Amino acid sequence: TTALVCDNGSGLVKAGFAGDDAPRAVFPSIVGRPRDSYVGDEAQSKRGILTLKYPIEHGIITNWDDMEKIWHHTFYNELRVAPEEHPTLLTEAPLNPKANREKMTQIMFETFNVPAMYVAIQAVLSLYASGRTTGIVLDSGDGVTHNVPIYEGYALPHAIMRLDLAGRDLTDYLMKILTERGYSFVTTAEREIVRDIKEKLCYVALDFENEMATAASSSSLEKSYELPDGQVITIGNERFRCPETLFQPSFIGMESAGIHETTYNSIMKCDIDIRKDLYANNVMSGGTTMYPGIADRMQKEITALAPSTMKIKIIAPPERKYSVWIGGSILASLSTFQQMWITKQEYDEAGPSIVHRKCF
Template sequence: NGSGIMKAGLAGEERPSLVFPSYVGRPKYKKVLPGSMHEPEYYVGTEAEQNRGLLKIRHPLSHGIVENWTDMENIWRYIYNSLQTMPQDHPVLLTEAPLNPVHNRERAAEIFFETFNVPGIFFSAQAVLSLYASGATTGVVLDCGDGVTHAVPVYDGFALTHSITRIDLGGRDVTDHLMLLLRRAGYIFHTSAEFEVVRQIKEKNCYVATIYSSEDNYFDDPTKNASAYLLPDGRPINLGAEKYRASEILFSPDKVGLEYSGVQECLLNAIQKADIDLRKTLYSSIYLAGGTTMMPGFGERLLSDLRKMSPKEIKIKITAPPERKLTCWLGGSILSTLAAFKNMWIKKQEYEDEGKRILH
């Protein structure tokens, strides 16, 4: 249930059956030609992607928190229709970012139990599932997605809840900053559909600079090292320093006036909050997860910054699984097939008997 990308499928599958952007599009214009098919009130999934130029796009999730429950329900309904499954036949494993508001979980459970009539539900932190998919039981997961970055230390299968750190900074903020940098360069993007174009520019061209000042020297002449990107309408735009300056906000949010710590500090704080006897193990068992960590140079920059901030004798090892965009879903797919997991579902009858307090 990601802020940027939804992944859905049946337990036991090796890959999600559905992977699509987490947004709902509504038509901006009225149809003027008679005889055409009935126009849907909203579009989700591939249809929303294909028609985005005609749509006003809204993301129901912002920084891991649902802000529009009607659209969130529409996305979940689209998933059931696409999978051709009946909600009452299958319990649901739903992922969420750690340290989310209590209300978010309660409202989600209410919709699944009362609207979709599911037999059971289980909420799991994204990072824990990512570690599970990597085949490890000990480590610290840095999950950097579209809306949230969080670091979760896990030791022998136990999440160290007091050590979890979170910052509301992710890939969407990088896209926002890239849009601003392109505007300064003379390229104007302002509609919700054009925001998705900028996101694609980011995914295909942006990278993280290992040494920021060195990149500045490399791009001191804006025209010398620029690369061209072709927009959907055929117009080319030149990308220079924007390619690495956009992603720099992940490591130096203060450059754009944000009062967050960077992702490297988020990770370091999580390790430092753990018991002193566990820290050495956690330093050598860092796992990356989330689509934003796929950006070229992310792991190298993280390692470089951690070495500067950590004791010299500490061995730091970062594992970046190639499928880390999907490891959270894969972990959930594996976990929900285990026989022992059947006792962990919150059943509908239990929810009706005990109410919302059973969710916590």
């Protein structure tokens, strides 16, 4: 039968069928229970009477009962499949604990009775989707941003870097600075509008201070945005101040290094034998890398940090919002991969620890 691919993130589930070019189901990774459980948009609609929780925090599954609900809902309600009929590829964060990976495996086989499964590293899937087995991935999602250097298909765990800021932070920051302008974006409905502004109108400046001067000197950078009630507002320097936070986390009160410095710092940790290959194969992935201008800015920033003679390249695939999912879709469809699934029989004999002998 067809394999399933489920890429569970902190903010969004991306799920579908291996061989498709995109996930069929993309929905909020949220479970609501009375203040008898509800998922995603149905939980958000009932937030007045439910306590909402996110079962994945910074990519890691932290609430297992709620994750079981997400997975059940995904199979039965979003995909409308019988999970016992389909091999299922799941994804994991960088540095996912062994015990976590084993528990995911056990749930798949014991709670959902899947015939087979696999767990792949999200960054490896994105690198693979880009046509590479060596490079360094910058994966910026809704909750977390990571740098994952990968050599000949293997993630280098000693050199993974984390930045505890991503898309939900940028949405909230945009609300804040738009409010400072004189608007009022404060309510949860107002958050949804601002996520839309963010995804439609924001961009990364090549030179932040130059761009500030331009925005303050003229209207050349302003855009209008029609609100749900029909009211038209103007977005100016907020277009690029919002994603500047990726490069300057101090904008939201964080002391952490920005994404250019985490990229550089990750590379430095890797064997000097492979540094030249990482610099020439920086691959962007995840929703929060979607800003226009981000590759150009990274290129400039890493150039400043690295030795002057280093060849540096930033690859930002058009389809990078879902490249984790797409890599999973391709991989699960390959003839060669079919020997790699962990089968129910194999799990029955070896137990959950079989999952660690994985090549993705």
